[PDB]
């Protein structure tokens, strides 16, 4: 438990706070509001769980059944089913899961900061850091349709390397002025991906 509490105070240093930012016609705004609310709820739950487990590891607090299970699985090193709300690849370890959650929290903090001040369209986003990327893409499509008064059925995608999506990574290919080229490299990073609805 001494080393467990050492690691327990080690992990949550990158998790401090998140705002919740509530009735607008903008699909992007309402989607970002509900996503940052979900992220804030998850962050508060994780912080409360960490505070409770620190208190029971070193402090005046007895261990309940839930806290006993939590401390057992944290010593074991596997992610709890309670924290796993979004998609995690094949049970990633907690060491990288906390970094992934921290990255998501910082991204949502930047989203809330930008929305606190449209200016929401000018931001740049990374698609892997959101909870529901298909909801993000459909919200972008809905925003484009609402702006241009077009038909959702025949709305295609033109992709250039007017929405900025970052963090996309290729698999055995290279991009030069939007021309794919085969390569022996395992993966390549796309700098910035432009999405236009035509």
């Amino acid at each position: 438990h001494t080393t467990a509490s050492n690691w327990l105070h080690l992990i949550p240093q990158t998790l401090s706070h998140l705002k919740r930012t509530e009735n607008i016609k903008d699909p992007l705004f309402r989607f970002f509001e509900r996503e940052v609310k979900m992220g804030a709820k998850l962050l508060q739950d994780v912080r409360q769980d960490l505070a409770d487990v620190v208190q029971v590891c070193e402090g005046k607090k007895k261990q309940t059944n839930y806290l006993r299970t939590l401390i057992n699985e944290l010593v074991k090193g596997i992610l709890p089913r309670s924290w796993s709300h979004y998609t995690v690849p094949a049970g990633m370890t907690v060491i990288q899961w906390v970094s992934d959650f921290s990255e998501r929290i910082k991204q949502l903090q930047n989203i809330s900061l930008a929305a606190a001040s449209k200016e929401l369209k000018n931001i740049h986003v990374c698609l892997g850091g959101l909870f529901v990327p298909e909801a993000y893409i459909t919200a972008t499509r809905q925003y484009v349709a609402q702006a241009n008064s077009w038909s959702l059925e025949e709305l295609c995608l033109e992709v250039n390397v007017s929405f900025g999506v970052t963090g996309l990574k290729l698999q055995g290919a290279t991009c030069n002025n939007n021309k794919l080229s085969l390569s022996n490299a395992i993966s390549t990073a796309l700098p910035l991906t432009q999405l236009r609805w035509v």
């Binding site: 699909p27 059944n65 919200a139 809905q142 349709a145």
Partner: protein
Amino acid sequence: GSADIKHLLPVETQRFQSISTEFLALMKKVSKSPLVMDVLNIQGVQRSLERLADLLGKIQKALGEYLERERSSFPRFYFVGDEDLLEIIGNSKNVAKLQKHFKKMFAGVSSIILNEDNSVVLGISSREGEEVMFKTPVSITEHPKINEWLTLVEKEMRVTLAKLLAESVTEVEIFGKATSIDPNTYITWIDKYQAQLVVLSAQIAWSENVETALSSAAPLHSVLSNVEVTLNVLADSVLMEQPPLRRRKLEHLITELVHQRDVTRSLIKSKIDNAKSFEWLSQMRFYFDPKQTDVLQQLSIQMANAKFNYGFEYLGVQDKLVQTPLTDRCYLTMTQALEARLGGSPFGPAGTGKTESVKALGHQLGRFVLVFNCDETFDFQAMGRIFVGLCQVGAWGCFDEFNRLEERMLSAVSQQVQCIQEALREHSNPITCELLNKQVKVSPDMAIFITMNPGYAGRSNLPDNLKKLFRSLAMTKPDRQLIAQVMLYSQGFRTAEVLANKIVPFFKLCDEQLSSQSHYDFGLRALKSVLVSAGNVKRERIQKIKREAENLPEQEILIQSVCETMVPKLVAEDIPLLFSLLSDVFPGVQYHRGEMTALREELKKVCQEMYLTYGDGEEVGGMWVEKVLQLYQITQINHGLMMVGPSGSGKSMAWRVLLKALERLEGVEGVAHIIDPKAISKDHLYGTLDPNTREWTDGLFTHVLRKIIDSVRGELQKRQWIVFDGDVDPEWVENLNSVLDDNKLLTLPNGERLSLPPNVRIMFEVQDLKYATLATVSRCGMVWFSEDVLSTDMIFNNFLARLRSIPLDEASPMLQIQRDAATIMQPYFTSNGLVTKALEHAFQLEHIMDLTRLRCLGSLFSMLHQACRNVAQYNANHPDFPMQIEQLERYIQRYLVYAILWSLSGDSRLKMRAELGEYIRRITTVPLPTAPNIPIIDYEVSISGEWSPWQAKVPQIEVETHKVAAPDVVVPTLDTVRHEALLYTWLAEHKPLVLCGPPGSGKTMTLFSALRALPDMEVVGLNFSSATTPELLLKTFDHYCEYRRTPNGVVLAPVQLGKWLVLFCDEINLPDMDKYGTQRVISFIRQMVEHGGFYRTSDQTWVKLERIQFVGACNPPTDPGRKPLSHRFLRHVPVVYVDYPGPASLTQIYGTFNRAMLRLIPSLRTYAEPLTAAMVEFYTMSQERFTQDTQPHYIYSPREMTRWVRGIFEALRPLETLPVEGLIRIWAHEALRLFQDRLVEDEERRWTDENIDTVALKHFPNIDREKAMSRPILYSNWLSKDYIPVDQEELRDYVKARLKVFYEEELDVPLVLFNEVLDHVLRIDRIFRQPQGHLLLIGVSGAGKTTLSRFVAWMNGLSVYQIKVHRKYTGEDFDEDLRTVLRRSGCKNEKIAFIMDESNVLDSGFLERMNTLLANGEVPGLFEGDEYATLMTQCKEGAQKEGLMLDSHEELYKWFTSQVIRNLHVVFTMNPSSEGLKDRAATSPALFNRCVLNWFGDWSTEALYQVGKEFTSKMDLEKPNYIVPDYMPVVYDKLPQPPSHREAIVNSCVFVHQTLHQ
């Protein structure tokens, strides 16, 4: 009971008559003397019974052979069960019964139409009402043989369908060859010919046309033009109004024609020049030869290398599948599998259209199909029976959800599937395979289909040998756009393509934009329901226009249908998201609602009648009324329902009031059956199958459905609503996935198929869907009852209405006093007021259990009902001076604040009780006592309307010396009196309640002090374990209550009339939580609390409790062994939290006991207060350090202090002259025996000894420390009759003499005596001394535990009992052992010691019976039948032998239980294990509550040294010249210095043993 059996089987009839007469004589001779010995004394009774059994077996085998011969005579009679077929045999002359079994023998032939004299059948009739006239009628007169005339019916039906198909093809040739088609001729043709015939005729005409065109570019264009012309004619014909049968025929035919148009377009897009191209060979092909004289094989259905013959079986109308290209690919691979003689096996996620696609393929080929919902209850004999039924008929099996089939059984049935596949492969080239050790004919039309979902609910996978026999096919994404377009064009819509292209991506965005929910479904099933609702509302709007062709608002119609289907499914947050999606998809959207004035007014009337708050849409009840209307719409348009929401959202009242309003409107009575699925086992819910004989009993739901189907009491006319008031999990809800689907039937393992009539709607009342699967979410309609739908002010208004009407003791003074109370608490309940603010603050606070609104609200309502009862009692007490208005006001206005305090904060700690009191004092202007320090919770409202403190109520009592630690005596304190008043308040109303708190907090003591105040209630104590089943409650009811038949049903009443029987459950939350978040006992108790009773599983009859109430005790759910309860149960049951008394209460609680017991010594009485003050902080420090985290048995409670005081009192009762040092020695010895035997390591034992020394020194200065405290500190009564201290050496000599005597009588096994064995034997003797003393010894085997127990029991005159465990030791033999032990204990009145080991336990029933025996002292449900009467006779004989004369049964049983408590001592031996200790803590609370724990452990180093030095002292081991080494390896402490040779070698032996450990 049939006279035809006598005629058909005369020899068997005579044999049965002889057997019956012989058995009549035998049973008359038996009944003339019912004694077992007298029956055995009959001459030749065994031989007569053997001969009768042989004769019965012979006649049974003969009748079975004859019945199987009849089955072989008619192949379709293999479906009919034995009793129904016997009824058919006995009803051959009369044919009024035979019309009720055609559903199981034919796909759609519901009934057949006969002549008026029934001498000839003329044709068949469909389920819908369509008819097919036979070409030549079948007369049963010239063919009286049932098989002969039924085969004539079959072949006549075949040739009739063939002739009709040929005529239809000759007719449709004209329409195919005509450029323009006259609608009148087309419609009269369609009316002339059946649905399947006209569809197949269109197929044949299209295939012949395309073949001729390809034989002759331009001809293909001509064929496509002809198809488009026919399609335009169809659209023109279907746009107008038509009879429903013709409308369905046109819909099916237009779907088929649009599929044919798509196929021809695909063919003409490429360049096809020959008929051998695969692009043409891969589609459906039909061929008709007029030259074939065999009309059965006239039609050939062909695909790519797959030639087939049409089934020619009537199917009715059914539903036509939309020919998706995915469906075409599925058809291709299924027909390839069928040609390869391998059964097909589509698989994929639920809702992709697997079983419906297989059904449509089977209907396309004309084959009879049978959809089976296989589950874990399928047995091998049942599966073989349905396999042989398929094989001897030709019906296609369509086993749905094949993966949940008990994988060992899956492997077992793989062999049968292999035999069937091999038989078919041989058939493809008198063809017979063997099934269930019997050769059975195989029809050529066989097919087995498997519909399985991978990874649905963790179901079992498939073995590879079985996977090899099935051709897999994955279907994941059906063409939603194409199916929507085709079905909308079929139903008739001008902009069908636009509507589909707008509604399918609408669902695509709807499945992704909204929040994730466990009960959200947007699959193909939801899309199809939306489209069908759109068609229905379009027809309704067309009728609404036409009552007064043109155009209709198709977009508005579709939006209205999608709203009426989807908006009840949503949560309150997602409705604006859905509305925005509809706005952007359809700009000119609009909406329409209302137009429900009649139902709305009837709902208002019944809401007013039933004391409910009505809303019109924007008032207080608007959301709830809107939800009721949504439920009505979903009931009308859908099949299966569920009301999803948190506990207490008005779903039950919603569906009840809707049922009553619907009954008021339509005039049809609404019968509703409420079933809890988890309160009983799934076996009891659905039905049982005997492995011995293949006989099927009905479960609860199956019996209800069978009764509805039979409709002997006109059940079909009335509206039937079956509700499953429980929680859903895929173990039992997957048995209804065929019921809730469009198949509309229930399948059973024995093969009996129960269709579902349209009158029945199957609904659910669930809390969450987080444990059910998508396969069962996707089938029902969701109505989401949110938490804020039901409002606290509506609850208050209902409570006030129920107070003003419906008096408590059911004009009357109760009515007037209730009305006065309602009028004076009216300003408090309404709007915000007081109670809502207090409730919001209570929700802000935390509690021991989860706090819901309705728990504390029901608490409040019961407390106020008790206040009204108190006012009524005072009014009766003062007839000259009734209750004045201002006094009633100033009394109820304070009872209200007291009641909300003890309701909202009744399950919290003292600090938060004070916090809520301070909050209420700050927030309300109500007269309150003036005390800045005393909380409001420390006050009692008086009948005079003033606050009376409890501190004035509690008296300073001094209990007598005779009872100091008796089980019933309680000294009154603040907490005890407050909880006493609260418990009396609860129990006056016969309401459930749960005492939650830490173990040993006095909760059952408080409850029993409450029950002893009211003489009208008697307690039946129950104890729960981990493996607790509602059978325990059932047997408690069986023993303590009786079942009585009444005109309004059956009722359960206590045997003692005029009394209320209360059930006390000490471990209510301890029953285990299963894999799906439920407890069967908890759900059972909740069901009987809500609905007033349960379902008697003997005959599935609803039973009603007459005078039964429940009281509960439990540990907090945070404890290691306990689990939290469900909200749906915690709603009705208030929870009161009792904590440990603490020092400031325990001081006087045990000061009164010590001052009561320090009376026999008139000189010691000045030490009572320092003695109690000394015993306080020892208990406090033991609580401080030895927490439950270290060990599961480290629980310290005031039960230990009570045992302490009782031990001191038993020690010094005869001693009568004790100095201070002797008293301190007794105190220290009791402290050691209570706080050191449970410890494990020696360090904590040393800590306890140091604590005892420092406590005695601190609290008792200037005393003889050496005299009071010593090393051995032993106490015994063997040497002298008084309980005096003994010396170790004198005790050892006496014990050695006792062993030397003891080896002679019982066991000649020598023993070695040392200090630890002396301590153990004294401990066991002391625990055996007190009555109801039960042991628990933990230690490694071989430490002498059972031998020492045997020695103690021999010394104290206790008969040692060993259970004599052997092989195949089962439950009945264990119960025989227990009943013999209990008989010898309670009837013979002898001292008995029960010795049994952990290894002697083989089943959890053993541990459960030991649990209840240890705790209650009796085992209910153990003595039944004449064995019970023998026990009662033994008990009355024992009473007569003792001297006391008793009577009746219950007091004799109570005396027997008291004798068992006094006599039976039970000893347990365990082994130390980390898992085992907490496992037994979870599975047996009595083993760690009613049993004192002794931790022998392994032998210590000192014990090993002493036994070695004692044993090796008999031989020469001294070396006169021995050199002590300077290293001196020391493993045993306190070695003598300098050690000798024998000391060194004994130390070496100890070292050897320790090094073996490491």
